[PDB]
């Protein structure tokens, strides 16, 4: 359950884009 | 990537935003 | 002056392994998430593999995942495919490919890649 | 995943006419479309991003359009180095490509 990045990144990524998920590199 | 990007640092949310599916 | 060179491609019997390698040039390769993408005999664009610019992230479709794996040596400008039980739906040219956005921008020649008896 | 459904699969043009290429996502892809143009015995090489913008070095005669899940590529002034086969790709969700449009000549 416990995060990898200071920044709690896969806590941010799971608000910002929820059941879309995320890629690894950006799109814009 | 967003590995090498976001979690040394904080992004904005319109950045992490870019790396939505 | 961006320059991608694919080599290591050649035939292998079904259940075999081969590595293919990709050279980089003309730009800060380790600054870039770099794949993999197949054209099939169909000519269908197949993307393969996927690597973050610092080797942090890596990504594969299902038609390959845990066969596949892919790699990169920053210090020496060099991206790797390490490909294991390969079976014959796997015949195509191996493109090396750069995504400075989520888009590829640069392509090699490639290197083709037969699996056959 | 997202489905490119490209057409024409392939396509036969004049010299100096204009040809017109179709990709239709099977969700809104917020523009995220880039364009290749693939000629054998070398790599692809990438045409326009984000609908329409192009890179740098390309020829204005190429161009792109669309938003939602409707978009279109188009070559004006056909030239011969234009023969090739094209690609569409979605880089809004994943990466998925167009099947591709084989562009011939008229004759």
């Known amino acids: 359950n416990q995060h990898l990045c200071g920044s709690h990144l896969v806590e941010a990524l799971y608000l910002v884009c929820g059941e879309r998920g995320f890629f690894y590199t950006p799109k814009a | 990537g967003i590995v090498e990007q976001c979690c040394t640092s904080i992004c904005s949310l319109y950045q992490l935003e870019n790396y939505c599916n | 002056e961006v320059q991608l060179v694919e080599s290591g491609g050649g035939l292998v019997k079904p259940g075999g392994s081969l590595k293919l390698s990709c050279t980089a040039s003309?730009?800060?390769?380790?600054?870039?998430?770099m794949s993999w993408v197949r054209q099939t005999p169909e000519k269908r664009l197949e993307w393969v593999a996927f690597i973050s610019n610092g080797g942090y992230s890596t990504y594969y479709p299902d038609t390959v995942k845990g066969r596949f794996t892919i790699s990169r040596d920053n210090a020496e400008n060099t991206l790797y495919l390490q490909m294991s039980s390969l079976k014959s739906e796997d015949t195509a040219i191996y493109y090396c490919?750069?995504?400075?956005?989520?888009?590829?921008?640069?392509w090699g020649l490639g290197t083709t890649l037969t699996v056959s008896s | 995943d997202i489905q490119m459904t490209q057409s024409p699969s392939s396509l036969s043009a004049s010299l100096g006419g204009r040809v017109t290429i179709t990709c239709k996502a099977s969700?809104?892809?917020?523009?995220?479309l880039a364009w290749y143009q693939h000629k054998p015995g070398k790599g692809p090489r990438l045409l326009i991003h984000?609908?329409?913008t192009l890179q740098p070095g390309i020829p204005s005669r190429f161009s792109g359009s669309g938003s939602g899940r409707d978009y279109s590529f188009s070559i004006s002034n056909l030239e011969p180095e234009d023969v090739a086969t094209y690609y569409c790709?979605?880089?809004?969700?994943?990466?998925?490509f167009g099947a591709g449009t084989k562009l011939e000549l008229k004759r």
């Open positions: 984000y609908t329409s």
């Open positions: 490919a750069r995504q400075g956005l989520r888009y590829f921008d640069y």
């Open positions: 969700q809104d892809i917020n523009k995220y």
């Open positions: 790709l979605q880089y809004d969700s994943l990466l998925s």
């Open positions: 003309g730009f800060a390769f380790s600054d870039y998430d």
